[PDB]
Amino acid sequence: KNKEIFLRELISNASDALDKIRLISLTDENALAGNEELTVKIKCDKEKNLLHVTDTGVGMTREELVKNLGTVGFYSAFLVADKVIVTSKHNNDTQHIWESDSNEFSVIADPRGNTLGRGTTITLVLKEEASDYLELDTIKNLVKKYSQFINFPIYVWSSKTKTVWDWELMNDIKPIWQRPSKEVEDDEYKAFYKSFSKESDDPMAYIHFTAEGEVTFKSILFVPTSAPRYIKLYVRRVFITDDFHDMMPKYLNFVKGVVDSDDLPLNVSRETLQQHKLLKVIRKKLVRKTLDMIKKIADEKYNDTFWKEFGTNIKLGVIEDHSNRTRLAKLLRFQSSHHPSDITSLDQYVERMKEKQDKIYFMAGSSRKEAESSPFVERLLKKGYEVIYLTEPVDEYCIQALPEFDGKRFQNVAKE
């Protein structure tokens, strides 16, 4: 019922094959000698009932083709095809052909020899009910749709008017995080987020900034709509990794998105890159702009959505991140005696204090009902003070890591 997905899936891998050979060509001087271009080339063959999707990517050795495909949403190609033919050429091997009707497979050396130079061609023998993917206009439309966020030129063999056939580019190789913000539509920012985590729901909030200073990088970060129960780094526009975990601190692990330095050493090992001094700088900047992004959330939306998902994170942040402790404190929310259910900020608490009250009162409990029914609060409430209810186990350690807030010291009502 959603068969078209196949072409997104094919395009998706082509891009990863292209990203793989690129990483290689950072340490390997020869990598691209087999074929100088880095492109995805899609061709129709209506008369032969075929669909080709050719990447000048990393390619596959004979041993790889057998293992990687015989023993990756990919296989979705069988939704539209009776037979799938993978013709590949890797730098460490001679050209090969893998073919399958999904009942078995066979890998033979390519009789035509090295026709590809380097890369892969996925040839689909299309089903009699998928004859619509032979039409140029259907294909262009699909390609263009799934092209949007690919950073590698995608061409389709098309006609133009007498009749001339040629490669027609389908997308903008120019990444969106490299575009000026004023020119980026809010739809795009959202799509781009979907196009690298699926779930296909708007992100709770995105920030898009270009960093000046000790290090220079463009970036987009996102706050996911639900706490998952992550960051792709690029150097001079060349994909490097996402296995970088010390990117963000622990309490901010939920953040997703891209960082695109032009200052980092491009032609290094990922070992070397990770211990690089500039990363700790790039880290600092990202946390600050994440906490900026979080601040910018609409006041109602913050208490109702964000805080429900990531409240604990923020509470953890106050504990870990001493250098942002104040920026975080202002993001904290709690229940309090001021209202049955609504959560209140610490600033909102202060605004409400009595003139000679210099202590922020809190009662710790296991649940709200426990803490509010406490005998300690009785006198405080009756004399019109407000008491914060700490009901999560992290809360008391949060508050315990917070000396003053706005010149006010905290006070455990259950204590002297």
UniProtKB/Swiss-Prot annotation:
The modification N6-acetyllysine is found at K301. Its EC number is 3.6.4.-. The modification Phosphoserine is found at S269. Detected in heart muscle (at protein level). The SRT pseudosubstrate motif associates with STT3A during translation in normal conditions, preventing glycosylation of facultative sites until HSP90B1 folding is completed. Homodimer; disulfide-linked. Component of an EIF2 complex at least composed of CELF1/CUGBP1, CALR, CALR3, EIF2S1, EIF2S2, HSP90B1 and HSPA5. Part of a large chaperone multiprotein complex comprising DNAJB11, HSP90B1, HSPA5, HYOU, PDIA2, PDIA4, PDIA6, PPIB, SDF2L1, UGGT1 and very small amounts of ERP29, but not, or at very low levels, CALR nor CANX. Interacts with AIMP1; regulates its retention in the endoplasmic reticulum. Hyperglycosylated form interacts with OS9; promoting its degradation by the endoplasmic reticulum associated degradation (ERAD). Interacts with CNPY3. This is Endoplasmin. It comes from Canis lupus familiaris (Dog). The chain holds residues 95 to 594 of 804 of the full protein.
